[PDB]
Amino acid sequence: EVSQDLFNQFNLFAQYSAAAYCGKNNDAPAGTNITCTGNACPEVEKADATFLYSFEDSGVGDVTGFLALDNTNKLIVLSFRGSRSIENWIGNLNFDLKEINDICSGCRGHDGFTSSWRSVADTLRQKVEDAVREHPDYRVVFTGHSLGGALATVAGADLRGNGYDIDVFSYGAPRVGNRAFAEFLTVQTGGTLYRITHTNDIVPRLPPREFGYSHSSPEYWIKSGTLVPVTRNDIVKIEGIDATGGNNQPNIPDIPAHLWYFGLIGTCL
Numbered sequence: 001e002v003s004q005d006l007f008n009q010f011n012l013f014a015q016y017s018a019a020a021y022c023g024k025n026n027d028a029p030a031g032t033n034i035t036c037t038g039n040a041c042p043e044v045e046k047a048d049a050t051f052l053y054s055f056e057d058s059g060v061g062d063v064t065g066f067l068a069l070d071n072t073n074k075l076i077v078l079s080f081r082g083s084r085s086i087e088n089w090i091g092n093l094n095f096d097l098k099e100i101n102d103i104c105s106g107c108r109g110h111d112g113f114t115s116s117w118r119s120v121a122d123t124l125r126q127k128v129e130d131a132v133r134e135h136p137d138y139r140v141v142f143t144g145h146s147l148g149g150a151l152a153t154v155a156g157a158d159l160r161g162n163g164y165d166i167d168v169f170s171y172g173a174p175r176v177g178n179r180a181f182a183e184f185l186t187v188q189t190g191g192t193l194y195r196i197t198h199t200n201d202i203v204p205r206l207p208p209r210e211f212g213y214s215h216s217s218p219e220y221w222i223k224s225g226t227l228v229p230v231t232r233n234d235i236v237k238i239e240g241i242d243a244t245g246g247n248n249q250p251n252i253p254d255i256p257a258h259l260w261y262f263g264l265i266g267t268c269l
């Protein structure tokens, strides 16, 4: 149900997300190479990818991840690590909807995700902008898994519009705001949002919709099981804000499903 090239991208960015969890990639020196223990990120190691900016424990809520320059794919990637520390975890629990009119009118965002991003937005905005300046033909992709995908999604919407497109691939990310935000993210221009969910990962199902949360459209639903490898016939495209049929179904959610997005993700020591 997906082009081989979309499939290829989906995998490449699942490994960049994965790579953000690896400890050594969070305090790496600029210019060294992105590598992963285990085989967390073979493709990324295969490419000519080097650290532009490595950050850890930044702003509020322990914002951690890296900014890499991929010369092989002509890419400027900003990957956010998902949840690992306790501050990451406390921050996810600020689930009250904060108001993010600056981003869009009527739009309300999950508090913590927004606060974390807002607390590190300038520094990162500028690191991305210098990057683009030096490699203006390169493509800017923001990515991440779970909390990292939420971060990537709001940073994405926040920075789109300064003369460089921003594509966002998110894996197993939770809802990030009200329906106003959901509609906004669905339509924004200046790059694409790729919202990838896996079977019944519990994470894309929170916060509940009763708290006033929604999901943007569409959703690329990976339907092959945990530990089995993904092919392009497994990824299905589900359309419509708060659509059911994809991940969003009335049934028992699962935890380990969240850990399997093309390969093991989030478990990188």
Ligand SMILES: CCCCCCCCCCCC(=O)OC[C@H](COP(=O)(O)OCC[N+](C)(C)C)OC(=O)CCCCCCCCCCC
Binding pocket: 083, 084, 085, 086, 089, 092, 093, 095, 146, 147, 174, 202, 203, 206, 207, 208, 255, 258, 266
């Ligand atoms: C019903 C739960 C209340 C949540 C309310 C809504 C808030 C939004 C949630 C943000 C979603 C998010 O990215 O992480 C949320 C999810 C949900 O975890 P869980 O199975 O709900 O935890 C319930 C367990 N308790 C009851 C103790 C709280 O992480 C996962 O699935 C687990 C991911 C495993 C990776 C290991 C993490 C290691 C670092 C942290 C160790 C303490």
